[PDB]
């Protein structure tokens, strides 16, 4: 059982969330710019808390990854296959949502 470091000044629950932030795959500048692109279509006077952008990114990446997990789990071949739009669609029908 590996020894565990527990800082005296910061809770591990905070540390875990920062760590997850460093694990995200979409570059943060393009992500915030995509949010801008969407917001422009709603209202030119909308502001976003920075933390709201962070929640959006964490959730959006989980959503995309789950689409791929579902497709993966529905794909059973002895030789590997390239995944196409129809595979995503089918898998979403089989084990995905709504």
């Amino acid at each position: 059982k590996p020894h565990r470091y527990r800082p005296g000044t910061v809770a591990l629950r905070e540390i875990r969330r920062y760590q997850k932030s460093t694990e995200l795959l979409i570059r943060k500048l393009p992500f915030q710019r995509l949010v801008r692109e969407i917001a422009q279509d709603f209202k030119t006077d909308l502001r976003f808390q920075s933390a709201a952008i962070g929640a959006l990114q964490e959730a959006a990446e989980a959503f995309l990854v789950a689409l791929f997990e579902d497709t993966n789990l529905c794909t059973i071949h002895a030789k590997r296959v390239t995944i196409f739009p129809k595979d995503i669609q089918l898998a979403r029908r089989i084990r995905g949502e709504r």
Binding site: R17, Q32, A55, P85, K86
Partner: protein, 205 residues
Amino acid sequence: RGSRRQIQRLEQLLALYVAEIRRLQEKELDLSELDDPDSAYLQAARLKRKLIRLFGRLCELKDCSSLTGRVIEQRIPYRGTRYPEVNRRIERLINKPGPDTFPDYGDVLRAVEKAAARHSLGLPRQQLQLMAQDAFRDVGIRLQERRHLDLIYNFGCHLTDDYRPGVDPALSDPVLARRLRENRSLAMSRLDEVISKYAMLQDKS
């Protein structure tokens, strides 16, 4: 054991990083700021990276592992086949550390084949294939569950830490609830529509 003084200094810095991250998280960004490479969001992300590096350095200083208590640190057991050698290989496959651990069917089938060949189990091809498919299904469920819990147990920040579903404003304002219901119909159709759009484009090629 590490220097008590240096540990106390570094932990002070760690807390300073936290306070600055929280300050940046509460900044309100207009549209021009969302276009800024030096926005509060990007400053915050850079500070989170710095903080995680410092955390790692403190782990090394106190001779601890770099674990943080993430749900994805929890090992998923697999004992699904009648062959413990195979079971072992699958369990190793699904418990590699980090956020990218999620095999495809091919990886599981390869683990089964390799285990069987290594231990001369004499298992024929179709038995291996069925074993692999049952395994892949079983571990797929558990991997998805572990990731889901890792997300919902480690989401947001101090600003959302007091959230509870019973405080949802829509619960006591039917005009709001009605608009959200309308939005929901639209959202589902929009997602269906993009999925179907790319399926249709595939059909034309």
